[PDB]
């Protein structure tokens, strides 16, 4: 199975193998057990060629996994700047909201990656939007008494 | 005749240390033990034999151990201006302390050096041959002078059934205190020493503290300051054991003449006057007994009944001038029995001068007075730590740490039962 | 009670402990050489309680680390036995300081550990200084403390462990290898300083204005924070001198034994500290978010226990009324169930460049902010499962990752509730 092996393949980070998987017709947007996409492994771990490689491709770049993360959700969270911004560039929905109720704006603030947050700010992310517990991302830079974070999160 | 001293802990050992410098100035001993004035035994039969052996080379040993789970503060004492004074097999130390915790003193490290104190005491025990008891100093806070005071006067109860132990308490202040758990320790103790002591003298270290600052001006009194006027007071309760009176002449007669009810057997003192380095009569210090800020343990005597008096006097003081002052009191102020007890005030005069060390804070004054009055008003004082007590067992904080040095969490719950009992007691009795 | 084993691992935990070494060795008055050139009575007084030569037991998987020890100012007088290195390093796995790389390296260590112990005359316990965001530092020290915990279950566990905060260091999974440790650290230490990098980041950049902290201005907070909480143990005193005391004071409930260090006044690497303090100004301190080194706040929470010490020349007539004042003006800060819970120490040797100092070590309910905040980011990352087979691939289940995240879960909770608690 080719799809399998795409997805060890974009999560392993040999580009060179997911050319060649691709080359011998791969499902790109295959999903593994939960979900997740070659782009979803690929923009988790920070491998940004595979990343726009796959776009190129006709990935989806708003695929969720049954826990409705998007590749955006997840790029935010580990801090992969340059893949946040491929993202966006590729249509990415900055305003996704996943099972958890957090957005991409979520996950950046809650890890401290600021200049991600400015980047997801100038692409309209809502500062207003709440996660289940009510709180928004300047809420987490409140509670969280994160004064660097406030500060960029009303710029 | 003969009494042995049992300073244990930190508090025990420096107050001993105060009390026996005392002791030698008072009967003209020098710090190697020489007595230019008695004679070699002879001739071992006199008044301060009591309280000090006779070698045959002439040197006057104090009959008293002194025992601490540290060595830090009785290595000072071997030492120091007194080092000659003491028989090294007198000062007993080992390594590791209590730790502020009652059940190390107790029950955990305790038990590793019980044996070695019992010994070092019947080796004194067989030096004396009319022991009367022994007179028992240390802490209430302190996990020594908690745990392996209660578990000595317990062993002591068992080896030396039928002989009186009296005790000088150190009861804890948060101006001086070092742990937490103080109040634990202090009820800890009074419950398993209860029946065990036939006499307690509580030492209240903010009453004591207060006097230093109000009547020797001392801004900000250390444990040398404290000491020494706890000394003074230890010095007026057993000169009539040193000095061969009239009244409180053996350790039985503190019981008969101040505890006339065995579970409440703890005397106020308050001493007078106080003077700092920068004459009263007969009637003014006298009338000075009976104002609370000389009290050695604060609590309002006002609000309770007494259970038996005892005035000791020392210096140029006569007779005729004590009943008088004591007639005026008896009638001035308002000084209320139990119907069952006399009534009456037992008087004990010493003649000489009272005694200060050189270079202390106390001014030498012709005459001084130490009343000890059983009143219910030392209750206050017992109050007072079962309330601090019930605030933390609530919460059960800081239980754990006793629990984890062989003592069982029941033993908290039967401590302060039997302190709520003592409560009553005292409640019964001022009714 | 007399002397204290030093241990330092992984990175972090070698350039705090250094620092320590060299903070106290100027102190005491010992130069590198290990020789006395000081001038008091009072510093020798108990030098056997860190000394014997440093007691200190170096190690990293990390080789590199040797290095940079030896290469500082004081490298020269450690033992070189005392130097534990693998050949690796963990790469911020705490498995691989857990179960595998450090599992190998451990009995090594602990050789060291007993070859220094039974030279002892009286054992104090431990003493650990490390961080809890990487592998090393994290997961073999916690190791460590198990296996010392159970060799040496009658001496003290105490440890200085360092928080990562993403000001710091911009690794995700120091959230799970954090958790992991508080783990291992509620049931093994008798007591912890927490250390925050996110508040000594704060302090370094909002109030020493430091537009680019870096780990020595990091490394100067810590180390007069360390100078500080350790003054008692050091020089002769009646008031927690030693780790048992300071324990019995400071512990009311066994898994709460976390600190919130604070101490004034804040200094900068060089500065010049003019104009000294005076007492009600170092006093007020206490309650001032912005001198304590676990970004939480104490006005956020109640003291359950505080201890405070006083270094250099002053009143202890002054110390002592401002103390009860700062007590009875802000009682209701104070849990009411724990009477006279405030204790104070005075030492007449203040640290270097100062001349007079405040530290205050507070066993606070407010410290759930930090372990709040490290949650949150190991909650965040969890959920989506990032990394984990790192850890997996190491031997460790995700049950274990579980069971960590519900324990510190419920210290959280534990503190709440005290926090909430009624003397009524
Ligand atoms: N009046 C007076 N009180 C003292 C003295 N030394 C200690 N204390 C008090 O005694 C209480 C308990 O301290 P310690 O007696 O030193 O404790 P310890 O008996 O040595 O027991 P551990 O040290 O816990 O093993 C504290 O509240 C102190 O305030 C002293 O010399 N004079
Ligand atoms: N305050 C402070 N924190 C430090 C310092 N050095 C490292 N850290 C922190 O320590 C955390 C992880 O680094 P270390 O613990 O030193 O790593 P390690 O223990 O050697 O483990 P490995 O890297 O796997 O070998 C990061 O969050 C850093 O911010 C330092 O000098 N000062
Ligand atoms: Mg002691
Ligand atoms: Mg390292």
Same mark, same amino acid.
């Given at each position: ?155 | ?431 | ?20 070494? $060299? ?167 008798? $007591? ?128 002592? $009324? ?103």
């Amino acid at each position: 199975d080719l799809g399998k092996k795409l997805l060890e393949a974009a999560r392993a980070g040999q580009d060179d193998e997911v050319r060649i998987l691709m080359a011998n017709g791969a499902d790109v947007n295959a999903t593994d057990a939960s979900g997740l996409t070659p782009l979803h492994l690929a923009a988790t771990y920070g491998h940004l060629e595979i990343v726009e490689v796959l776009l190129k491709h006709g990935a989806d770049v708003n695929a969720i996994d049954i826990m409705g993360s998007t590749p955006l959700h997840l790029a935010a969270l580990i801090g992969h700047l340059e893949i946040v911004e491929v993202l966006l560039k590729h249509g990415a929905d900055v305003n996704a909201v996943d099972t958890w109720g957090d957005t991409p704006l979520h996950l950046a603030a809650i890890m401290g990656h600021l200049e991600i947050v400015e980047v997801l700010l100038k692409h309209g992310a809502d500062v207003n939007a709440q996660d289940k517990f009510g709180k928004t991302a300047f809420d987490i830079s409140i509670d969280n008494g994160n004064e660097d974070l406030a500060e960029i999160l009303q710029k | 005749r003969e009494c042995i001293s049992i300073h244990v802990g930190q508090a025990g050992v420096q107050i001993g240390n105060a009390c026996w410098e005392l002791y030698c100035l008072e009967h003209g001993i020098q710090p190697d033990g020489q007595m230019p004035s008695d004679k070699t035994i002879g001739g071992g039969d006199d008044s301060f034999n009591t309280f000090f052996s006779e070698t045959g080379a002439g040197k006057h040993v104090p009959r008293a151990v002194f025992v601490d789970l540290e060595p830090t503060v009785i290595d000072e004492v071997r030492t120091g201006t007194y080092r000659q004074l003491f028989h090294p097999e007198q000062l007993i130390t080992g390594k590791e302390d209590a730790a502020n915790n009652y059940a190390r003193g107790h029950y955990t490290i305790g038990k590793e050096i019980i044996d070695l104190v019992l010994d070092r005491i019947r080796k004194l025990a067989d030096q004396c041959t009319g022991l009367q008891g022994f007179l028992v100093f240390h802490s209430f806070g302190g996990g020594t002078g908690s745990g392996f005071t209660s578990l000595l006067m317990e062993r002591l109860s068992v080896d030396y059934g039928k002989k009186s132990k009296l005790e000088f308490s150190i009861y804890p202040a948060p101006q001086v205190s070092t742990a937490v758990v103080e109040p634990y320790n202090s009820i800890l103790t009074t419950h398993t020493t209860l029946e065990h002591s036939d006499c307690a003298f509580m030492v209240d270290n903010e009453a004591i503290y207060d006097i230093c600052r109000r009547n020797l001006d001392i801004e900000r009194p250390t444990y040398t300051n404290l000491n020494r006027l706890i000394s003074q007071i230890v010095s007026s309760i057993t000169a009539s054991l040193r000095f061969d009176g009239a009244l409180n002449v053996d350790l039985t007669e503190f019981q008969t003449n101040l505890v006339p009810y065995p579970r409440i057997h703890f005397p106020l003192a308050t001493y007078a006057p106080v003077i700092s380095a920068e004459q009263l009569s007969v009637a003014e210090i006298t009338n000075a007994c009976f104002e609370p800020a000389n009290q050695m343990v604060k609590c309002d005597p006002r609000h309770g009944k007494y259970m038996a008096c005892c005035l000791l006097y020392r210096g140029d003081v006569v007779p005729k001038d004590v009943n008088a002052a004591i007639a005026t009191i008896k009638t001035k102020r308002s000084i209320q029995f139990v119907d069952w007890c006399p009534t009456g005030f037992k008087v004990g005069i010493n003649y000489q001068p009272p005694t200060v060390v050189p270079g202390g804070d106390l001014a030498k004054v012709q005459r001084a007075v130490c009343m000890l009055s059983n009143t219910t008003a030392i209750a206050e004082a017992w109050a007072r730590l079962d309330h601090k007590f019930d605030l933390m067992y609530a919460k059960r904080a800081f239980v754990h740490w006793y629990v984890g040095e062989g003592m069982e969490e029941g033993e908290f719950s039967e401590a302060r039962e039997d302190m709520a009992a003592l409560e009553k007691d005292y409640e019964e009795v001022g009714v | 009670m007399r002397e204290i084993v030093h241990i330092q691992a992984g990175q972090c935990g070698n350039q705090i402990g250094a620092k320590f070494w $060299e903070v106290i060795s100027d102190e005491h008055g010992i130069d590198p050489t290990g020789s006395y050139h000081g001038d008091s009575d009072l510093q020798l007084e108990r030098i056997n309680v860190y000394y014997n030569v440093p007691r200190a037991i170096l190690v990293d998987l990390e080789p590199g680390t040797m290095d940079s020890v030896r290469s500082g100012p004081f490298g020269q007088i450690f033992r070189p036995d005392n130097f534990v290195f693998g050949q690796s390093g963990a790469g911020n796995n705490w498995a691989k300081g857990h179960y595998t790389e450090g599992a190998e390296l451990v009995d090594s260590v602990l050789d060291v550990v007993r070859k220094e112990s039974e030279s002892c005359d009286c054992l104090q316990g431990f003493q650990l200084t490390h961080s809890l965001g990487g592998g090393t530092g994290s997961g073999m020290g916690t190791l460590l403390i198990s296996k010392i915990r159970e060799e040496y279950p009658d001496r003290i566990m105490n440890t200085f462990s360092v928080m990562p905060s993403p000001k710091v260091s911009d690794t995700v999974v120091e959230p799970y290898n954090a958790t992991l440790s508080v783990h291992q650290l509620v049931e093994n230490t008798d $007591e912890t300083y927490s250390i925050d990098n996110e508040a000594l980041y704060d302090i370094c950049f909002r109030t020493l204005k430091l537009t680019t902290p870096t780990y020595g201005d990091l490394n100067h907070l810590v180390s007069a924070t360390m100078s500080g909480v350790t003054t008692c143990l050091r020089f002769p005193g009646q008031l927690n001198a030693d780790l048992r005391k300071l324990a019995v004071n400071m512990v009311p409930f066994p898994r709460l034994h976390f600190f919130m260090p604070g101490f004034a006044p804040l200094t900068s690497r060089g500065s010049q500290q003019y104009r000294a303090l005076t007492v009600p100004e170092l006093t007020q301190q206490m309650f001032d978010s912005k001198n304590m080194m676990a970004a939480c706040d104490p006005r956020h929470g109640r003291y359950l226990t505080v201890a405070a010490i006083f270094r250099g020349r002053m009143s202890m007539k002054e110390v002592d $009324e401002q103390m009860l004042n700062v007590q009875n003006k802000n009682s209701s800060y104070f849990v009411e169930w724990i009477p006279n819970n405030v204790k104070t120490a005075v030492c007449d040797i203040p640290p270097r460049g100062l001349k007079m100092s405040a530290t205050f070590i507070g066993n606070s309910t407010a410290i759930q902010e930090l372990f709040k905040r490290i949650s949150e980011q190991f909650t965040a990352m969890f959920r989506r499962k990032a990394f984990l087979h790192w850890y997996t691939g190491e031997g460790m289940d995700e049950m274990e990752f579980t069971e960590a995240e519900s324990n510190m879960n419920d210290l959280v909770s534990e503190y709440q509730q005290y926090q909430d608690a009624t003397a009524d």
